Amino acid sequence: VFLGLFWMYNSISVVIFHFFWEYQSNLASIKASAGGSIRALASDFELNSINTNGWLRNFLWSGAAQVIQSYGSPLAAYGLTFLASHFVWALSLMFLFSGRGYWQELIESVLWAHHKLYVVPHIQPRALSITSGRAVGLTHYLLGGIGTTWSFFLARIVATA
Amino acid sequence: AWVGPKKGSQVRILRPESYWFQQRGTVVNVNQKTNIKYPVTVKFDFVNYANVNTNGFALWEVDELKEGEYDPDL
Ligand code: CLA
Ligand code: CLA
Ligand code: CLA
Ligand code: CLA
Ligand SMILES: CC1=C(C/C=C(\C)CCC[C@H](C)CCC[C@H](C)CCCC(C)C)C(=O)c2ccccc2C1=O
């Protein structure tokens, strides 16, 4: 289930990316004017969502202007949540890539430092268990990715619509 | 005659690899048989990573401490 949650995140992220790019493409196309009736392709999605580079340029990098240029505007909160989501997502990487034993030994050294000063907590400091570490990493990964998409989508669709 | 730490007396662990090394524990019982290599059974307030706080130690791996010659604050 832990791995299936990552793959659900991937699946739903691609699904919402497809929907958002199609929605923006349709909004731009219906903004032809009235006279413009040959949309050819145009349809930025239909013309560019065929490459990974097409996505990376015309959807992510293109629409990120709204969320990264939101400082000093009411969408500055979306910008800050964008940054915080990236931070939480890299912290997830921290939890997912690492293992319990190392952190246990680090906590052993820190606890020696505590005992040296007569601090000695009795609820013995133990690092997160293997499953607990995986769960924390997955929670942070989902939070960071979903929050990044949340901030990006909301800033892009509120500033431009 | 009795050999080893007295029952219920605090001892300091001299086993370098023990989870309670140089810490303090209470002696539960000492096996009065010469063939037992680790007779001194010591109980600790702290549990190790295996969630067990009782272990047997050799006679030379425990230092019996007097009633007031150790540090009560660990
Ligand atoms: C000390 C370790 C450390 C730190 C601090 C950072 C810092 C950062 N990494 Mg990072 N990283 C590190 C080690 C570290 N790296 C290592 C070893 C690796 C492995 C190679 C990585 C791999 C990595 C990746 C892969 C990514 C990052 C990213 C980031 C950035 C996250 C965006 C940001 O600033 O959000 C913080 C900014 C804010 C504005 C948040 C503040 C406002 C929020 C809403 C509030 C949070 C405050 C908090 C709640 C305290 C308030 C308390 C109150 C509630 C009481 C940031 C520059 C991301 C990035 O920059 O993408 C381009 C990213 O994707 N890192
Ligand atoms: C930007 C920084 C940031 C953010 C946003 C989070 C966010 C989170 N961390 Mg976290 N963490 C961070 C940095 C951060 N962490 C750092 C630096 C470390 C150390 C490396 C950790 C270590 C860590 C561990 C070890 C664990 C978390 C967990 C969690 C989750 C807690 C779930 C919850 O609310 O339970 C409560 C659930 C509710 C439904 C309560 C309702 C929601 C509340 C009301 C939201 C508002 C919170 C609060 C009111 C904000 C104000 C607090 C105070 C100032 C009043 C949450 C997703 C835990 C969980 O991971 O995932 C399994 C967990 O075990 N974190
Ligand atoms: C096994 C579990 C399971 C099942 C049964 C479904 C079922 C469904 N999901 Mg779904 N989903 C699941 C798990 C599952 N999901 C999980 C875990 C996730 C998270 C990633 C999702 C995420 C998800 C999303 C995001 C969406 C769906 C959608 C759908 C619907 C797709 C309808 C469709 O495209 O028709 C196509 C299929 C047919 C028309 C059936 C016929 C196809 C061919 C012709 C059959 C060939 C038969 C052949 C003769 C015999 C073959 C035998 C051979 C195998 C030996 C359908 C109800 C979509 C939906 O409901 O949209 C409205 C949608 O948007 N799912
Ligand atoms: C240091 C570099 C760095 C790093 C590490 C990150 C890290 C992240 N960014 Mg990010 N970003 C950066 C720089 C960086 N950013 C810069 C400089 C910009 C421009 C301002 C952006 C703009 C940006 C946007 C606009 C978005 C992110 C998102 C994300 C998150 C993706 C998490 C994940 O697993 O996605 C999993 C990876 C994917 C789902 C792939 C999507 C990307 C490709 C191009 C889509 C291709 C679709 C196509 C149909 C092929 C599908 C294949 C399928 C099998 C996956 C993560 C927090 C996204 C997010 O929230 O999560 C997705 C998001 O919406 N970032
Ligand atoms: C860091 C790490 C630990 C150490 C984590 C510990 C010891 C959890 C304790 C962290 C404390 C509780 C953080 C408290 C919350 C932070 C202060 C941030 C939230 C509040 C701020 C936003 C203000 C593990 O135990 C572990 C286990 C398995 C795989 C990977 C890892 C892993 O990566």
Lookup: tokens for A87: 């931070």
Could you give the CA distance from residue A39 to residue B57 in angstroms, rounded to a whole number?
Answer: 85
CA-CA-CA-CA torsion sign (A56, A59, A65, A71): negative
Radius of gyration of chain B (CA): 12
Contact across the interface for B73 and A122, Cβ inside 8 Å: no
R_g (Cα) of chain A, nearest Å: 22
Interface of A with B in 56-115 (CB under 8 A): 104, 115
Which residues in chain A have Cβ-Cβ distances shorter than 8 Å to B73?
118, 120
In this structure, what token pair is assigned to residue A61?
A: 């990098």
Nearest by CB to residue A118, choosing from B45, B47, B73, is B73
Cβ distance B63 to B12 under 8 Å?
yes
The amino acid at residue A136 is V
DSSP assignments along chain A, one per residue: -HHHHHHHHHHHHHHHHHHHHHHHHHHHHHTT-SS-----S-THHHHHTTSHHHHIIIIIIHHHHHHHT-TTSTTHHHHHHHHHHHHHHHHHHHHHHS-HHHHHHHHHHHHHHHHHTT---SS---PPPHHHHHHHHHHHHHHHHHHHHHHHHHHHHHH--
Tell me the Ramachandran region of residue A5: left when phi exceeds 0, alpha when psi lies from -120 to 50, beta otherwise. Answer: alpha
Query: What stretch of H or E contains B14?
Result: none
Other beta carbons less than 10 A from residue B39's beta carbon: 19
CB atoms within 10 A of CB A39: 13
Chain B, 16 to 55: residues with Cβ < 8 Å from chain A are 45-47, 49
Experimental method: cryo-EM
Give me ligand 4 centre to Cα A131, in Å: 26
